Design a protein around this ligand. Structure first.
Ligand SMILES: [Mg+2]
Ligand SMILES: [Zn+2]
Length: 516
RNA sequence: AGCCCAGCUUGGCGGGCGAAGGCCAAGACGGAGAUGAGGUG
DNA sequence: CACCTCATCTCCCAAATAGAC
DNA sequence: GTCTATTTGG
């Protein structure tokens, strides 16, 4: 029954962030910073105590940290504008973070908390309390205007998924445009709600249970984006029992048709969508194939890098012009202080010059126009420099997920390697350009998406020990030495004595080992 | 040529260059947080 | 000191209390 | 007296 899921809805791009939401984000950021400082003080005090059996001392110091955490609830929630759901969310995140840090230190790997700086991105939360002996928080309950959670979270127009899938995409997209009234904390003791105009693509099972929701705001290229994520407790799915066995193995051999990333071998024929056959290649028999990634991903990422370099060039030229003009002319006051050539010359970030241009948008001086001459163009190309990158990465991710789906649609047993990921990606990945491909390939992402699909769809997953498999030749079964002979493919064997493919032999070994 | 125009990816139609304006088709979809690395200024 | 990539691991609460009607 | 929003210890 316990299968948590998250459904996300995208707020309309024509929704300026209201002041209430901005203040909630600011308060959450301040709370996290204060918790970080308190934890750092606690860590230093524990170090000092150890620098002096002391468990009572440690226990006493820990309790004082607990009191300050409670006193933060008094400062931010009891006498502030923060919502008690946001505070609980941030406190839980901080507690989990410090627990993970302690676990890491126990092994011997050092770690520490790092401050951050507010930029406008953040998170607000809402928790749907369900006491014992209460009806479930089904989507029909949240869609009701006079329901229990009408002032906490209201998601109108829920249409049954069985009926939802029958509607055409036009009807599904036009009817999915709804408004969600979300509780947004307090304001001088005056509770505030926000009407998010959202677009919904999928709905929830009628038997779900909405545990909570959260609104996430992120700044991409200077433009705010908001997304509402709703968490529900879907009932579990019966695990599959019948289906072909598929073994998946990672690779990174460069190919003329893109970056080849994976090799899969199935014990029975698999059917692949015709929209993936250029990505998920399949041999004649349908039992083995290669997953390659297109070349457009690489071209787009290279174009983004070129854009970043051109931006650097333009910024350096503008810096030189600004320093020259400032030296040759007077300095109008900015930030209540005269402008100095030294400060401008040492500037690196485009943000400083963008802010200066905004301040001097209409100073009337010549350089102001020059400054605007840059600030316009920079704000365009910057968008490109990031947006295309995201799109490119998005494309790759989509492909991976699609591929994962097809496996869970047919496979009855999926096998994955274990030690052929980290160490192999560290050593045989083939340096700055060499390591660039692996970031663009990101085979670990494909592995993770496949694993997630198999877990969600009930497919059993078996992890095969890749130890002493790379050097193994399937046709002969002899361990060839590690003489970097595998820098290419195929590689001559030291057993039978013939060039054998390093990927097909590996996956056939995997299939043999699983069914033994 | 890019990026943007009711979630995301891919396409088609019609538009915008910081402002506009959306319409359709196919597919997939578990998010947040922190830490650790790799790099880049 | 600031930015980006990628890799791992957690987690997803509800009982008690006081109020507006 | 009944749903409801807030505080708080796991
Ligand atoms: Mg869009
Ligand atoms: Zn051999």
């Amino acid at each position: 029954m316990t299968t948590m899921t998250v459904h996300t809805m995208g707020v309309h791009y024509k929704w300026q962030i209201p002041e209430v939401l901005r203040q909630q984000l600011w308060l959450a950021h301040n709370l996290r910073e204060d918790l970080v400082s308190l934890q750092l003080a606690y860590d230093d005090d524990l170090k000092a105590i150890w620098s002096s059996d002391a468990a009572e001392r440690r226990k006493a110091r820990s309790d004082q940290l607990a009191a300050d955490q409670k006193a933060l609830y008094g400062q931010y929630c009891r006498d502030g504008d923060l919502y008690w759901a946001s505070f609980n969310t941030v406190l839980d995140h901080h507690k989990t973070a410090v627990k993970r840090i302690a676990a890491q230190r126990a092994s011997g790997k050092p770690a520490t908390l790092r401050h951050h700086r507010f930029d406008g991105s953040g998170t607000i939360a809402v928790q749907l309390q369900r006491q014992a002996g209460a009806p479930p928080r089904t989507p029909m309950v949240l869609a009701d205007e006079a329901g229990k959670y009408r002032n906490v979270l209201h998601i109108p127009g829920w249409t049954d998924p069985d009926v939802w899938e029958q509607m055409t995409r036009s009807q599904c997209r036009q009817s999915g445009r709804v408004t969600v009234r979300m509780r947004c904390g307090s304001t001088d003791g005056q509770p505030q709600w926000i009407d998010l105009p959202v677009q919904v693509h999928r709905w929830l099972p009628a038997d779900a249970d909405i545990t909570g929701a959260e609104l996430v705001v992120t700044r991409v290229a200077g433009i705010y984006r908001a997304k509402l994520c709703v968490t529900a407790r879907i009932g579990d799915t019966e695990p599959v029992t019948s289906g072909p066995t598929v073994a998946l193995h990672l690779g990174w051999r460069s190919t003329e048709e893109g970056t080849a990333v994976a090799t899969w071998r199935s014990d029975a024929p698999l059917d692949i969508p015709f929209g993936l056959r250029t990505v998920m290649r399949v041999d004649a028999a349908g039992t083995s194939g290669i997953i390659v990634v297109p070349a457009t991903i690489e071209r787009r990422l290279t174009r983004t890098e070129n854009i970043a370099s051109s931006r650097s060039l333009a910024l350096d030229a503008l810096r030189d012009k600004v320093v020259g003009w400032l030296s040759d002319n007077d300095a109008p006051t900015y930030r209540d202080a005269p402008l100095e050539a030294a400060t401008v010359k040492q500037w690196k970030s485009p943000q400083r010059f963008a802010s200066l241009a905004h301040a001097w948008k209409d100073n009337g001086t010549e350089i102001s126009d020059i400054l605007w001459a840059w600030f316009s163009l920079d704000r365009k190309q910057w968008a490109q420099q990031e947006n295309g990158r995201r799109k490119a990465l998005g494309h790759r991710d989509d492909l991976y997920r699609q591929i994962a789906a097809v496996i869970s649609d047919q496979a009855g047993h999926v096998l994955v390697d274990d030690t052929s990921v980290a160490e192999l990606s560290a050593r045989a990945m083939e340096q700055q350009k060499i390591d660039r491909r692996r970031d663009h390939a990101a085979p670990g992402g494909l592995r993770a998406s496949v694993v997630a699909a198999m877990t969600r769809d009930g497919v059993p997953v078996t992890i095969v020990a890749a130890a002493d498999f790379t050097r193994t030749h399937s046709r002969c079964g002899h361990v060839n030495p590690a003489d970097d002979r595998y820098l290419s493919n195929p590689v001559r064997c030291d057993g039978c004595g013939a060039m054998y493919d390093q990927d097909r032999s590996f996956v056939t070994l995997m299939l043999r080992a699983a069914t033994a």
